[PDB]
Amino acid sequence: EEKEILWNEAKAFIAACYQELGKAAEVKDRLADIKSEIDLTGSYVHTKEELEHGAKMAWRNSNRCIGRLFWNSLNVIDRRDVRTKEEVRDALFHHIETATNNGKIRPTITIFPPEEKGEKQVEIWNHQLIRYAGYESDGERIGDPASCSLTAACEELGWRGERTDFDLLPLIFRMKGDEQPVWYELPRSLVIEVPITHPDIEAFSDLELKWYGVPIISDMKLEVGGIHYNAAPFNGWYMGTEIGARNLADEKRYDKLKKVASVIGIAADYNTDLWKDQALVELNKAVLHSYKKQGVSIVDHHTAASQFKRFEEQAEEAGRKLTGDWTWLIPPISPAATHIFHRSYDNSIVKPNYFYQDKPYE
């Protein structure tokens, strides 16, 4: 039933993929080849074309993603050839450099060897390739609370952060055969960071806020035709609200709203003053401003929702069913000002797709 589930997923994927690629006549022989390859080996190997299209389909099927208009221009890097921790490290370094592209961010995914029989070849521990550490000692919070457990796991392994609010975590991953992961400090020249300033409130820089340029999600599994690529980091560019309404604003993250309110000169005393809302708007304005000023790609939530409307229209024109998760697609500020808020979406799960998987630590 191992070979059964795989074979069925393979048939459905190959058929759909080859149809979209205008290759429907080659389906028969390809499925024949695959059938034999599974019988003899227990698995099968995607061609470069199948893998690239599979990764693109997986993005197109990501219900929670508002950024999907651009699914077809995903830059897919095939690293199924890596065998060593130095190769993995260098592939991760290269991904960062090529995705960053001097600030003109390229949506990119790097695909490592897939699981064999549930056995991981490479297991990445980072949630994102670039992220800030988090600490707590003596009721003092430092850095990003969302990184607290990974940060403690790294320091167990001999890493030590400087305990600033913005320490970059090391890359950390484990190779098949090894009992422990290894870690590598990120070279600073690879990492673009953006200091947060406001277009017309000069005091805003007193907050000394910054964020990194590129979100490179590295803990999701790509599934394509029954093959499980558990290590396949990918990135887009940020939507400003991710930084301004969540990373910097959530009480369980950097919790900056009261400080923002103070620098923009409003009281943080009464709910009816809507000071949190006002602070959120000014922080989100500062975030868009700062990325644009530095020449780092970013999208605001209005522009993103307009793009998503086009994605919806493109889906209809192509005869493809659209799936989405309304609770994730709506932006966390002014959601009712977007068309998303005013319609519903089918939250069905279609494969290929990206999936959560269990953390190797904690």
Ligand X SMILES: C[C@H](O)[C@H](O)[C@H]1CNc2nc(N)[nH]c(=O)c2N1
**Residue 55 binds ligand 8VJ, judged by CB under 6 A:** no
Least distance in angstroms from the C-beta of 215 to its own copies: 17
What is each CA distance from 246 to 133, 148, 215, 232, in whole angstroms?
A: 17, 17, 14, 25
Considering beta carbons, is residue 110 or 241 the nearer one to ligand X?
241
**Residue 254 binds ligand 8VJ, judged by CB under 6 A:** no
**Residue 134 binds ligand 8VJ, judged by CB under 6 A:** no
Residue 77 binds: one of ligand HEM, ligand X, its own copies, none (C-beta under 5 to 8 A by kind): none
Residue 362, judged by CB atoms within 10 A of its CB (0-12, 13-18, 19+), counts as exposed
Of 244-283, binders to ligand HEM (CB under 6 A) are none
HSE value, Cβ hemisphere, 13 Å, CA-based, for 288:
15
Nearest residue to ligand X by CB is 328
Residue 127 binds: one of ligand 8VJ, ligand HEM, ligand X, none (C-beta under 5 to 8 A by kind): ligand 8VJ
Residue 139, judged by CB atoms within 10 A of its CB (0-12, 13-18, 19+), counts as exposed
Consult the annotation and say whether 65 binds a ligand: yes
Residue 154 DSSP one-character state: H
**Residue 261 binds its own copies, judged by CB under 8 A:** no
**Residue 299 binds ligand HEM, judged by CB under 6 A:** yes
Cα(170)–Cα(132) distance, integer angstroms: 9
**Residue 339 binds ligand X, judged by CB under 6 A:** no
Annotation says 59 is catalytic: no
Could you tell me which residues come within 8 angstroms of residue 179 by beta carbon, excluding any fewer than 6 positions away? Answer: none
Could you tell me which residues come within 8 angstroms of residue 277 by beta carbon, excluding any fewer than 6 positions away? Answer: none
CB 136 within 8 A of CB 148: yes
Annotation says 242 is catalytic: yes
Considering beta carbons, is residue 100 or 323 the nearer one to ligand X?
323
Q: Which of 59, 183, 237, 275 is catalytic?
A: 237
**Residue 127 binds ligand 8VJ, judged by CB under 6 A:** yes
Query: Which residues lie near ligand HEM (CB under 6 A)?
Result: 59, 62, 64-67, 70, 74, 107, 109, 234, 236-237, 239, 242, 299, 304, 328, 354
Mark the binding-site residues, compressed into ranges. Answer: 65
The residues assigned a catalytic role are 65, 68, 237, 242
